[PDB]
């Protein structure tokens, strides 16, 4: 080595911070690092500009390289003002933390080089650009510059609801203040969702996030293979949200829902519920309007670890959510939904992938009253447990003789096999992802496939078998439903695609099946 210049106190530490072993040949990395262990440090001596540049005498005859490290130190310059122009929403506060020299401190260009870049990960700048006090040679600034509502239309097709539309306007900057306002609208066989939504991501300067949701879920049952009941429901929820980890979050809020239960196909499973609340209309005729207004408190949690957003095969994803009313509304209940996700890659080459998503739920009515039936859990279908028709798993209802009708001589509980759902849900599925063959091996690493063994068990936690002999006890703890098969998912300029074929191997009588299902657009 050699030192030629004023280091202000690193003159001897060259062989300790910037050392190599003699005999090592001319390197552009392990000799430049000798330059670059004192090129960044010197902003810890208040020195603003640490300059290290070393130009050896490249000697070839008997091959020694005599390094000559001209290090001249900077000087002690300070942090007066941080100035952003053109942007009416970005703050001088968060755009200080995402840089690494606070206001009122010894300042340097080279040790603010740890700050300028991360400011762009806000997701709203196109560029993130980067002063001695104007005409005064001691105090100094750090400055930046920034360069800164699109419709969207969705049309899909499918098996669970066939046709499917989306259309809504998003504008993630309300007049220059960072509020995220977004609208959405979806229509298909059973529900039509037309929602407005707002958010302020920084309620507190430190991260608290407040969203107020105005939704409307004009739903319908018969087209969705269930039994008969119609729902036009409107409600509004508001939730807080505060970051805690960047691997976590948390939320809490107050949620008011209002439902119009009507047009019910008389049947025991819901007619237990009507009594306990206090409504007993005619037991075989369908002109009845049960109205609920539920206020309900809600909360959640989250976790993210995946490395790649698109076609992810790493990390671990989690979710929790619960809910409970105050005991001062119409129906009183609570609800607990847990979610999981895990993409385990076994080696760096990343062709073997392991995935399995566990989900749990449970609900109950508190003071002896019952969970509303439209809030139950449904299992079986394409998106959760492939092979069995959508919703088809869940202890079936029992139609009354209504107008099972008295024209044919119906005078009892006509046993039915129609899916209704349930209140305790548990779905596991272990999936074992494998390479993509049969296409050119140049690009045979894209179109994903997997073999899967999906289970699903919803039951009525309060269903009776004292009173129903000829029927089984529909609360069996191990009435599992496994299935297997295949399916191919990928990207193409016509949206998200997948095609499937899954054989239902295990099931019980009364459990329908659906071997084949597809997805284009959205499901």
């Amino acid at each position: 080595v050699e030192v030629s210049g004023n280091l202000a106190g690193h003159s001897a530490e060259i062989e300790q911070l910037t050392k190599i072993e003699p005999g090592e040949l001319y390197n552009g990395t392990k000799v430049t690092k000798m330059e670059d262990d004192i090129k960044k440090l010197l902003g810890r001596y208040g020195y603003a500009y640490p300059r290290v540049q070393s130009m050896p005498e490249i000697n070839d005859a008997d091959k020694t390289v005599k390094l000559r490290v001209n290090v001249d130190a900077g000087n002690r310059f300070y942090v007066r003002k941080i100035r952003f122009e053109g942007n009416d929403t970005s703050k001088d506060a968060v755009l200080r933390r995402e840089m690494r020299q606070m206001e009122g401190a010894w300042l340097g260009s080279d040790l603010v080089d740890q700050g300028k870049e991360r400011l762009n990960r806000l997701g709203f700048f196109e560029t993130v650009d980067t002063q001695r006090v104007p005409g005064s040679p001691d105090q100094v600034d750090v400055v930046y510059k920034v360069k800164e509502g699109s419709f969207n239309f969705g049309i899909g097709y499918g098996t669970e609801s066939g046709v499917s539309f989306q259309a809504g306007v998003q504008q993630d900057n309300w007049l220059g203040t960072g509020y995220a306002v977004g609208i959405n609208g979806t229509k298909n066989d059973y529900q039509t969702y037309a929602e407005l939504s707002v958010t302020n991501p920084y309620f507190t300067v430190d991260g608290v996030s407040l969203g107020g949701r105005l939704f409307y879920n004009d739903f319908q049952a018969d087209d969705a293979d269930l039994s008969d009941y119609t729902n036009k429901s409107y409600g509004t929820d508001v939730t807080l949200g505060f970051p805690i980890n960047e691997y976590n979050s948390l939320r809490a809020g107050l949620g008011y829902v209002h439902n119009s239960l009507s047009n019910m196909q008389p049947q025991v499973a819901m007619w237990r519920y009507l009594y306990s609340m206090g409504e007993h209309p005619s037991t075989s005729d369908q002109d009845n309007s049960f109205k609920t207004d539920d206020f309900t408190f809600n909360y959640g949690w989250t976790y993210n670890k995946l490395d790649r957003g698109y076609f992810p095969t790493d990390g671990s994803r989690v979710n929790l959510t619960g809910k409970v009313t105050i005991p001062g509304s119409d129906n009183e209940y609570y609800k607990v939904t847990l979610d999981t996700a895990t993409y385990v890659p076994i080696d760096d080459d990343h062709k073997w992938v392991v995935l399995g998503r566990t989900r749990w739920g449970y609900g109950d009515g508190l003071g002896g009253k019952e969970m509303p039936f439209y809030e139950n859990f449904y299992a079986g279908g394409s998106s959760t447990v492939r092979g069995f028709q959508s919703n088809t798993i869940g202890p079936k209802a029992v139609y009354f003789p209504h107008q099972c009708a008295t024209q044919d001589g119906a005078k009892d509980l006509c046993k039915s096999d129609d899916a209704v759902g349930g209140n305790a849900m548990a779905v596991a599925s272990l999936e074992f992802i494998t390479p993509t063959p049969f296409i050119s091996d140049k690009y045979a690493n894209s179109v994903r496939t997997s073999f899967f063994w999906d289970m699903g068990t919803v039951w009525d936690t309060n269903w009776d078998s004292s009173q129903y002999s000829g029927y089984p006890d529909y609360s069996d703890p191990s009435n599992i439903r496994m299935s297997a098969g295949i399916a191919l998912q990928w990207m193409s300029p016509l949206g998200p695609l997948v095609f499937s074929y899954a054989q239902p191997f295990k099931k019980y009588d009364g459990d329908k099946a659906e071997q084949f299902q597809f997805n284009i657009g959205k499901t």
């Binding site: 007066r80 003002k81 206001e103 009122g104 309300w174 007049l175 220059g176 203040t177 509020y179």
Partner: protein, 138 residues
């Protein structure tokens, strides 16, 4: 309510306590009174606060479709009046001062109205910072 009550020389924010401020001296000329706006321009919270109160005061006239009309006209009227009253809650009296530093210059600075009444010709001390200045009278 935006809290623009710290724009005075008789209160301070928590970000300018326990820091070091240089002190200059000056004589004062041309005092004149000025109003001072403050905070948001979008006035989002006044909009919602006036809108819900103009909506739930719409459910109280007429019935049927004649009520569905009132519960929207009242909503929009309340939404506008919300901004019209919130942005009139940030208006604040203030003063604006031109001063000659004994360095030899002339600068002028605007400030919340306080208790002490400035005079055309006095002595003031300029608490300086990273371009933030307060003018105490003495």
């Amino acid at each position: 309510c935006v809290n623009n009550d710290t724009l005075s020389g008789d209160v301070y924010t928590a970000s300018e306590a326990k820091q070091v401020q240089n002190v200059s001296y000056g004589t004062i000329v041309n005092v004149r009174p000025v109003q001072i706006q403050g905070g948001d321009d979008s006035n989002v919270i006044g909009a919602i606060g006036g809108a819900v109160l103009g909506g739930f005061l719409g459910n109280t006239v007429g019935g049927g479709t004649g009520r569905s009309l009132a519960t929207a006209a009242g909503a929009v009227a309340g939404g506008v009046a919300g901004q019209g009253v919130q942005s009139a809650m940030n208006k604040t009296q203030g003063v604006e001062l031109e001063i000659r530093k004994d360095d030899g210059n002339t600068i002028m600075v605007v400030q919340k109205q306080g208790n002490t009444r400035f005079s055309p010709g006095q002595r003031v001390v300029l608490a300086s910072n990273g371009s933030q200045v307060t003018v105490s009278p003495r």
